[PDB]
């Protein structure tokens, strides 16, 4: 068995989309409000997240068939999956050695306590770190990592979606690509596809925990003022 | 002639209010998104302005009688006068030597071209600089500088004000203090009170120019996203 021409184009276009939207030098980080170590990390992390939301939008626009969807459907998918894509893409900076995200210099080496100093609790950080360790151990190929993010983004089971029949078709077409990629190109990937599909289930509960914690944060004007207009809009509850 | 006990209390309370809300070390400036020299200065200036809006709110709360007003009236006065207080208070960092605002290190030495690189035109910068040079030459006492800002903030001729009879009383009581302060404590201040009242007229046209320019800026989502939630709220058009 081997990958069709169409499936190969999907992989190439996604890898190039990731490459365009993920800067491995983390150079743009010096333009955010600086890290400070009561809710001292909120400005830097609001800025980091906002910058990432822009990247996820840029990536989504290059997922074949996403641009063809309704602006409304595109918004619904982005609003509900943005945080999950942030969690997934952050794995590229997550290191098993230090159990932290390392983004450039010594100032952008982020421990779990930083997220604590940014309005979040161990209820979110316990499974976020566990999710990162679990995902890091899968030693995903760039093709799988990028495919998983596109499967996640194209989940039709999102609140707000209208043409969910078209979205389910896009996602299944992408899963066929992943399942085959593993089969043909990943030695000892017998259990991988399932292991990755389970990682999408973990993202849902992590989405849920973040949402609760963010609601509490966003309801305090003294904190919501430290957020950015894009973060407010994307994590907000408007329809 | 000499100042009453009541008028002296007004001066003391205002000077202390200014001292609490104006940090002469400009140390907090390192916490803003950094200066970058298309609309490269917008993040740093959005942050600088937002920080100043917080200061002006802190100051206003210590102006005798302001806290006693309606939350609505307090908002109306703040929304329409905030930019004028920013313009007034910025004079403390304005230098006649370099024709720029000098706030701490070499990175917070701001020339007129910086405001240009932040979405504003020479239609605003020509009179802003002229206003600063004119105000700097008045060599105002700290008492006069602080009194002028409180007169400006307590202008009852603002869109949105309700109990404008009470506000006009507060302002007139403050003008009596200024007029007397100059008379008794300022040698050669024969024309000063009038010269300062004229500076309030200049602030209105500068308010007007900024408002036009800000509307143009805030109407472009790619730019409004670079602003802060407080700036959006204060310079916004909600009632």
């Amino acid at each position: 068995h081997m990958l069709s021409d169409e499936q190969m184009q999907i992989i190439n276009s996604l890898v190039e989309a990731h490459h365009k939207t993920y800067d491995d030098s983390y150079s743009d980080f010096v333009r955010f409000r600086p890290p400070v170590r009561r809710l001292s990390m909120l400005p830097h992390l609001a800025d980091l997240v906002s910058y990432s939301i822009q990247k996820v939008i840029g990536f989504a626009k290059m997922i074949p068939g996403f641009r063809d969807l309704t602006a409304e459907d595109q918004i619904a998918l982005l609003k509900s999956s943005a945080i999950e894509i942030i969690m997934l893409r952050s794995n590229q900076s997550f290191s098993l050695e230090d159990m932290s995200w390392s983004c450039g210099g010594p100032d952008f080496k982020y421990c779990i306590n930083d997220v604590t100093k940014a309005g979040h609790t161990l209820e979110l950080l316990e499974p976020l770190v566990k999710f990162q360790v679990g995902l890091k151990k899968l030693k995903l190929h760039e093709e799988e990592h990028v495919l998983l993010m596109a499967i996640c983004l194209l989940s039709p089971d999102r609140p707000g979606v209208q043409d969910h029949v078209r979205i389910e078709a896009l996602q299944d077409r992408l899963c066929d690509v992943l399942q085959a990629y593993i089969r043909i190109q990943h030695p000892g990937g017998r259990l991988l596809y399932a292991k990755m599909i389970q990682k999408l289930a973990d993202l849902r509960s992590l989405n849920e925990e973040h949402s609760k914690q963010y609601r509490s944060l966003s309801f305090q004007p003294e904190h919501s003022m430290q957020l950015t207009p894009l973060v407010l809009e994307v994590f907000g509850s408007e329809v | 002639h000499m100042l009453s006990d009541e008028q002296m209390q007004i001066i003391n309370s205002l000077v202390e209010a200014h001292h609490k809300t104006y940090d002469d070390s400009y140390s907090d400036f390192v916490r803003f998104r950094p200066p970058v020299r298309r609309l490269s200065m917008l993040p740093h200036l959005a942050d600088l302005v937002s920080y100043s809006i917080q200061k002006v709110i802190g100051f206003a709360k210590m102006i005798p009688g302001f806290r006693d007003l309606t939350a609505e009236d307090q908002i109306a006065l703040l929304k329409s006068s905030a930019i004028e207080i920013i313009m007034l208070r910025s004079n403390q960092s304005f230098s006649l030597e370099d024709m720029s605002w000098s706030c701490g290190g070499p990175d917070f030495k701001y020339c007129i071209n910086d405001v240009t690189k932040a979405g504003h035109t020479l239609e605003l910068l020509e009179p802003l600089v002229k206003f600063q040079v004119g105000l700097k030459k008045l060599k105002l006492h700290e008492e006069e500088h602080v009194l002028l800002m409180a007169i400006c903030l307590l202008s009852p001729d603002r869109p949105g004000v309700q109990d404008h009879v009470r506000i006009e009383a507060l302002q007139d009581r403050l003008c009596d203090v200024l007029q007397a302060y100059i008379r008794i404590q300022h040698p050669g201040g024969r024309l000063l009170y009038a010269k300062m009242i004229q500076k309030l007229a200049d602030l209105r046209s500068l308010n007007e120019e900024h408002s036009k320019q800000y509307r143009s800026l805030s109407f472009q989502p790619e730019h409004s996203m670079q602003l802060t939630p407080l700036v959006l709220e204060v310079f916004g058009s909600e009632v």
């Binding site: 602006a71 595109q74 609003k79 894009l230 994307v234 | 989502p221 409004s224 996203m225």
Partner: peptide, 9 residues
């Protein structure tokens, strides 16, 4: 969703 709309071109 002003910003999202713009960001999506």
């Amino acid at each position: 969703h002003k910003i999202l709309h713009r960001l999506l071109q």
